[PDB]
Amino acid sequence: TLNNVFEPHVAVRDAAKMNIPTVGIVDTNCNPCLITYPIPGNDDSPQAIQLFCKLFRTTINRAKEKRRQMEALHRLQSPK
Amino acid sequence: YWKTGVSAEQNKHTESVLQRSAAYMRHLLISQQTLRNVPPIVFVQDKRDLVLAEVDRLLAEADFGPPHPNLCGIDHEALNKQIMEYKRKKE
Amino acid sequence: SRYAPEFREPLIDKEYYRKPVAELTEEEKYDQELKKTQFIKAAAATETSSVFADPVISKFTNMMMKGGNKVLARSLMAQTLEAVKRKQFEKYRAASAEEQATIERNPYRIFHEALKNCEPVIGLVPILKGGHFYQVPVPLADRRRRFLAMKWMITECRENKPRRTLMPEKLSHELLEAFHNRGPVIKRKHNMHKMAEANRALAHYRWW
Amino acid sequence: KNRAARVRVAKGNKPVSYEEAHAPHYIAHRKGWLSLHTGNLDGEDHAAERTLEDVFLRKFMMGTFPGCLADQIVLKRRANQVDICALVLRQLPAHKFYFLVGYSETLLSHFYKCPVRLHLQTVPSKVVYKYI
Amino acid sequence: NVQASRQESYTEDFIKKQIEEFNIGKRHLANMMGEDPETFAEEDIDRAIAYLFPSGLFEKRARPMMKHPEHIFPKQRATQWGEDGRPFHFLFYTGKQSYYSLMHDVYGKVMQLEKHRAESRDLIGSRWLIKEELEEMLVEKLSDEDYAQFIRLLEKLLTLPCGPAEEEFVQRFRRSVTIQSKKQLIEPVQYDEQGMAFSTSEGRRKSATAQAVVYEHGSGKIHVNGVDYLIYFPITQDREQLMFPFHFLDRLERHDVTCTVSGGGRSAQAGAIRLAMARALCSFVTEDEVEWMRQAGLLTPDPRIRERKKPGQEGARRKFTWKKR
RNA sequence: UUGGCGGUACUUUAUAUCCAUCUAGAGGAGCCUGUUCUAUAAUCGAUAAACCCCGCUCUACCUCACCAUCUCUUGCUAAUUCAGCCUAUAUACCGCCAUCUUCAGCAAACCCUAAAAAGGUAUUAAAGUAAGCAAAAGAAUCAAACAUAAAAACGUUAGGUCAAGGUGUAGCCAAUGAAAUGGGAAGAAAUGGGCUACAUUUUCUUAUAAAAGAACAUUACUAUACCCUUUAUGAAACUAAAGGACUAAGGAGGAUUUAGU
Numbered sequence A: 001t002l003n004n005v006f007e008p009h010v011a012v013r014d015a016a017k018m019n020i021p022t023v024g025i026v027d028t029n030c031n032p033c034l035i036t037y038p039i040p041g042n043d044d045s046p047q048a049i050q051l052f053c054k055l056f057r058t059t060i061n062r063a064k065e066k067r068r069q070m071e072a073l074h075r076l077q078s079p080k
Numbered sequence B: 001y002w003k004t005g006v007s008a009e010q011n012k013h014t015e016s017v018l019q020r021s022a023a024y025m026r027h028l029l030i031s032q033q034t035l036r037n038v039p040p041i042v043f044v045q046d047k048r049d050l051v052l053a054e055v056d057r058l059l060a061e062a063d064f065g066p067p068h069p070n071l072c073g074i075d076h077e078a079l080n081k082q083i084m085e086y087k088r089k090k091e
Numbered sequence C: 001s002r003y004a005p006e007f008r009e010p011l012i013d014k015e016y017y018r019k020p021v022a023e024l025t026e027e028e029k030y031d032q033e034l035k036k037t038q039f040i041k042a043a044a045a046t047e048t049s050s051v052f053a054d055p056v057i058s059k060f061t062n063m064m065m066k067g068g069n070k071v072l073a074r075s076l077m078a079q080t081l082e083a084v085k086r087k088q089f090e091k092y093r094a095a096s097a098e099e100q101a102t103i104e105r106n107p108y109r110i111f112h113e114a115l116k117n118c119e120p121v122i123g124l125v126p127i128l129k130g131g132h133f134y135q136v137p138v139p140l141a142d143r144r145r146r147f148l149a150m151k152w153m154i155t156e157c158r159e160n161k162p163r164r165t166l167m168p169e170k171l172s173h174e175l176l177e178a179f180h181n182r183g184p185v186i187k188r189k190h191n192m193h194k195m196a197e198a199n200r201a202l203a204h205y206r207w208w
Numbered sequence D: 001k002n003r004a005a006r007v008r009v010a011k012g013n014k015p016v017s018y019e020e021a022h023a024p025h026y027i028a029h030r031k032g033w034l035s036l037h038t039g040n041l042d043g044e045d046h047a048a049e050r051t052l053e054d055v056f057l058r059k060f061m062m063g064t065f066p067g068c069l070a071d072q073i074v075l076k077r078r079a080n081q082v083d084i085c086a087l088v089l090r091q092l093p094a095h096k097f098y099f100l101v102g103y104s105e106t107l108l109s110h111f112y113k114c115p116v117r118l119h120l121q122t123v124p125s126k127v128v129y130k131y132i
Numbered sequence E: 001n002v003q004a005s006r007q008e009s010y011t012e013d014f015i016k017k018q019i020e021e022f023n024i025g026k027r028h029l030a031n032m033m034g035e036d037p038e039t040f041a042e043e044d045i046d047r048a049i050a051y052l053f054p055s056g057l058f059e060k061r062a063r064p065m066m067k068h069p070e071h072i073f074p075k076q077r078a079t080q081w082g083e084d085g086r087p088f089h090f091l092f093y094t095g096k097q098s099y100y101s102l103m104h105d106v107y108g109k110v111m112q113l114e115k116h117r118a119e120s121r122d123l124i125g126s127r128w129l130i131k132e133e134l135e136e137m138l139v140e141k142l143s144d145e146d147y148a149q150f151i152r153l154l155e156k157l158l159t160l161p162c163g164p165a166e167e168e169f170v171q172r173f174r175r176s177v178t179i180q181s182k183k184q185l186i187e188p189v190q191y192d193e194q195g196m197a198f199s200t201s202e203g204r205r206k207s208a209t210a211q212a213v214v215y216e217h218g219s220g221k222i223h224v225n226g227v228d229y230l231i232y233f234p235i236t237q238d239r240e241q242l243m244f245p246f247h248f249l250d251r252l253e254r255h256d257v258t259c260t261v262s263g264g265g266r267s268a269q270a271g272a273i274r275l276a277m278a279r280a281l282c283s284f285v286t287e288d289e290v291e292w293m294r295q296a297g298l299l300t301p302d303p304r305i306r307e308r309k310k311p312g313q314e315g316a317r318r319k320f321t322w323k324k325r
Numbered sequence F: 001u002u003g004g005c006g007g008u009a010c011u012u013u014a015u016a017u018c019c020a021u022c023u024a025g026a027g028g029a030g031c032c033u034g035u036u037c038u039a040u041a042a043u044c045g046a047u048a049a050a051c052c053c054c055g056c057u058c059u060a061c062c063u064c065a066c067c068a069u070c071u072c073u074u075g076c077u078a079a080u081u082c083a084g085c086c087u088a089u090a091u092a093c094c095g096c097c098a099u100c101u102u103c104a105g106c107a108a109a110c111c112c113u114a115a116a117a118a119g120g121u122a123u124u125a126a127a128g129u130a131a132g133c134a135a136a137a138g139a140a141u142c143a144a145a146c147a148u149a150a151a152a153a154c155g156u157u158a159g160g161u162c163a164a165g166g167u168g169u170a171g172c173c174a175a176u177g178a179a180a181u182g183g184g185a186a187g188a189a190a191u192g193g194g195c196u197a198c199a200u201u202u203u204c205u206u207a208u209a210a211a212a213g214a215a216c217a218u219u220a221c222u223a224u225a226c227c228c229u230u231u232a233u234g235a236a237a238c239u240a241a242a243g244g245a246c247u248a249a250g251g252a253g254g255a256u257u258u259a260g261u
C-alpha cells in the first residue's frame, strides 16, 4: 500500500474516489483507514509475500471453478 | 584543487605524486565511513596560477633587445556653424 | 560549409602512403584502416605533393594577397625570393674564401630563420577594467606567435617604404635584415617584449 | 508574420478545405494550379489577357451560382476551348442547374468569342480537409 | 465540449470493404491499360496511375495513389477488451501492455539464466533497433526512458550464459548494419584503333567540366582542348594542379592525356581536369594506390560552389550597412 | 499569491557574437542619393532598435495626388434627388507586412488539491493525461550529403499602410468634385547611405589578365563636378552617354562604428 517514496500508493485514494473496494496487506507503518478489507501482516519478507500470492491465487481459482460447476448443475436441470 | 607553490618544477612532481595515490586516498575515506560512496578524485592546478607562472617563464626567456570641443562634450565648432549659419540667414 | 562534420582533412604526404607497412606506428596504421570507411575532403587547388611546396611561404603569400589576386601575390613572393638569392650571390662572389663559407645563399632558409627571429614569445591583450583600458601580458600560442611575425613583416613593407620602391625590393631587404637581427620588424618584437615587463604585475586581470 | 492566403488557427473548430489549408509556399509542392493555360510558359504571349479573363470568369461563376459553389473553380484552356470545372453544392433543384449551365455557356461564349463549356460535379456538402 | 472531427478508427469490416474495392479497382485498371488482370502487380499499378493522372507536385505523398489498403491505412491497435468488458491481456491497466509484457518476458529469462548458473559476440556489425523500430514492433508509443530501460535489460541478458533460445530472442531486436563502401569505382579500359589502352573519366569543379582521356603508355604529353598545357595554362598554379595526380603516384612522364575542359575560369578548369585525370588514372594503378589517392583528396569532387545572393543584403552573406543611430 | 524589478547572489551561456582574435570598410576629400532644416505660391506617407536609393523594379510634359490662373455642373455606367471625392480617423478595419524570431512555445478537452489567487515534476519515477498549431519531418536549389533559401504558431510594439484596392463612422455636392494651361524654386547648411579617388600589389598601351614597353610628384596619381562640343530618346533635353579641354581638393581619414565563419 506504499509507493517507493514511503507514501500511500495513489490508487488507494483513487479507488475510494471511484467507490472500488480494496483488499490490502497493511504493515505496521501503513495506513489502513481507506482499505476496505485490511489484512495486517508482513509485506517485506519474500516468504510472507509468496504466501499471500498463493492464497489469493488458490482462492480466485476455486471461486471461478465453483461458478463453472454451479452453472452446469443448474443449466443441466433446465432440460432435465 | 590543491595549493600550488611558485616553483613550477616541484608542482609538476607534486601533481604526479598526488595523482598516483588518488585511488588509495578515496579508499581511506570510504573505509573510515566518513563518506560512504565517494566518486573518483582528481587533482587540478589553478589555471590562474599556471598562467602567472608561464608569463614569468616566457618573460625570462624573452629578449628585451640591445640596451577641446570633445572634452567638454559639446561640439563648440559645430554649434558655432549652426549659429553662424543662422546668422547668415538672418543677414 | 558544404562538407558535413564527418568529412576528414586529406593527407597529401607522398612518402607516408608508400612507406612499408611495418614502418608505420600502429596508431597511424589504425587511422589508415578507419579512413577507408570515412569521407575525405577534396584537396585544395593549392594542395599538392610538390617537393618545393612550403606551408610557411604559401601562408605568407596568402597574407599579402589583395582581393583574391593570387597570381600577383605569388609573383611578388617569387620576385622576393629571387631578389634575395641574387643579393647573396653578389655578396658571395665579392667575398673572400673565408667569408664565403658563412654567406647563406638559400632564400628558403633565409625566410624561415628571418620569421623565427621576429616571432614574439609574449603578447598583450587589451582589457577595460573599471572603465580604463589596460593591456595585460599574455603568453602567446604557437599559432599566435607565428601570425604576428608574418603580419609585422607584411606591414613594415607595405607602409614604411619609399614611394618608388617595390615590394620585392623592400621585402627582400627586410627578410635579410631580420635574418641578421637588425631590422625594424625585430625592433617591433623588442618593444612588445619590453612593454610586457612594464605590465608584469597586471597579468592578474586575466579571466580567460 | 506572413498573412498571404493563410487561413489562421483558432480553437480547432474552423473547417478548412485542402486548398485553403495550404499556404502559398506549397504551390507546386502539395497543391497545383487552379488555372492551366500556356501563357506563362517561356516565350509565350497573351499572359495579361488570359489572366484578366480568369479574374472575370471567377467573379461571374460566384454570382451566377450564389451559395452553390463548394470550392474554387478550375479553368482549363485547350486550343481556343475554355473548360470550367466547379464543385457545386446540391442546394438548387436539378432543372435550375440545367438553366444556369445553358445560360452561362452561351453568355461567356458570345463575350470572349470562344467555345466555353461548364463541368459541374455535385457534392453533398463541402469537403473538410482538417479542422484548424 | 470540443467539436472537431474524431479519429475515424477503421474497423475490420471497413478495411475488408476497402480491400474488395481495391481488388475490383485492379481489374478495371488492368482492363484500361490492356494488361492481364492475373499478372498485374503493384509496380504496374503505380506506372498506370502515373500515366493516367500526371502530377508534377514535388512532394510525392501528395500525388494520386491507388494502393492496397494495407499500405495507406494506418494499422491500428484493435479493441483491448470483449463485450463483457474484461480486458484481453493481464497487463491492460498498465497503459503500456505490450511494452511491459515484453519487459516481463526478458526479466523472466534473466532470472532463469542467473539461477541455472563463452564469447558473447555471436553477431557482429549489428545495432540495437532504434526507438522508432521498437515502437512499430510493439504497436505502441514509447518514451526515451522506456527505450533506454529495454536496452539495459537486453544487455544484461547477453552478459549471462545464453542458450540458443536467448540468442534467437535478442536477434529479433537486432537490425543488420550496412557499412557503406567508401571505395572508388575503377573505370573500364578501352582500346583505340591503334590498339593502345586508355581510360576516360569526367570531372567537375565549380562550373567547369572536363573529360580526360588518359593513355596507359606515354611520355607525359598533356593537351588541353587540342592545345599544349603550357600554352593553355600560362599560370604555374594551374599546371601544378595537373601535376598532382601523376606526381603523387610517381607516374610522371609515363602517360599521355587528352583533355576537353569547357566552362569556368582558369583555376576551375585546372581543378576539373585534375579530378578527371585522377579518376581515369585509377584503371592503371593498384587498388592500394587508388585508396592512397582517395585519402589525399584527389578523387573527391569539390562541393564548394558559388552561393546565391539574398534579397535585402549586399551579398550572399554580406549585409547592407546597419544605418547609424 | 502571481508578475514585474534588484548598484542580491550562484550556474549556463551568445558562434560572425557580449569580450578577445581576424579581413575589408564607414567616420576625413570630391561627387551621386535619402532625410532633416532653412525655405517656396507649391504634395502625401515612412521618420529609435523595426525610417533615412523607404512606397519609386524610379518625377522634363505625362506620371500628379501640390501651387497659380481659366473653365464645366446629371458631370465614365443599364438605371438611381444621382455621379464623383488621394476629404478626416491605420486609435473602427479587411487586405498585405515589420519586430522579438528559426525565439519555443500557443490554444482546447479532461483529471487531481483538507481550496485552487493558482499549481500539477521526480524514470530504480511521487498526479497528471489524450489530441491539434508551431517546430520537426518533408519538399526546393533537377545524384548524394552539407549548406542556402523557404518556413516559423499564439502574442508584444493601439508598430506601418484610409494615397494599391476595398470598406465602417463623420464631412463636401456651383465644390473638399471634373477638365485645360503654366509652374512645383533654393541651398551647400547638418546628417544617413552609396560611388570614386588618395596611387607602386600603382598609372597608360598591346594583349588579356600571362608577358612586355613606357609613366612614376607638381601637376605624376587624380572629378561620374562646372563648362564646351557630338550623339541617343522625345513633339519638347531640362535627361543619359561619348569626347574635349579645365583643373580643384585628396597624401588613407578623431571619438566612434558596420559586415563577414
Ligand SMILES: [K+]
Residues within 6 Å of the ligand: none
Ligand atoms: K491592419
Ligand SMILES: [K+]
Residues within 6 Å of the ligand: none
Ligand atoms: K548629403
Ligand SMILES: [Mg+2]
Residues within 6 Å of the ligand: A027, A028, A029, A042, A043, A044
Ligand atoms: Mg513493511
Ligand SMILES: [Mg+2]
Residues within 6 Å of the ligand: E315, E318
Ligand atoms: Mg562582396
Ligand SMILES: [Mg+2]
Residues within 6 Å of the ligand: F017
Ligand atoms: Mg559583430
Ligand SMILES: [Mg+2]
Residues within 6 Å of the ligand: none
Ligand atoms: Mg564622407
Ligand SMILES: [Mg+2]
Residues within 6 Å of the ligand: none
Ligand atoms: Mg502615420
Ligand SMILES: [Mg+2]
Residues within 6 Å of the ligand: none
Ligand atoms: Mg508635373
Ligand SMILES: [Mg+2]
Residues within 6 Å of the ligand: none
Ligand atoms: Mg499639369
Ligand SMILES: [Mg+2]
Residues within 6 Å of the ligand: none
Ligand atoms: Mg482632389
Ligand SMILES: [Mg+2]
Residues within 6 Å of the ligand: F090, F158
Ligand atoms: Mg496600428
Ligand SMILES: [Mg+2]
Residues within 6 Å of the ligand: F151
Ligand atoms: Mg520547417
Ligand SMILES: [Mg+2]
Residues within 6 Å of the ligand: none
Ligand atoms: Mg499608431
Ligand SMILES: [Mg+2]
Residues within 6 Å of the ligand: none
Ligand atoms: Mg479612397
Ligand SMILES: [Mg+2]
Residues within 6 Å of the ligand: none
Ligand atoms: Mg493620409
Ligand SMILES: [Mg+2]
Residues within 6 Å of the ligand: F209
Ligand atoms: Mg597583368
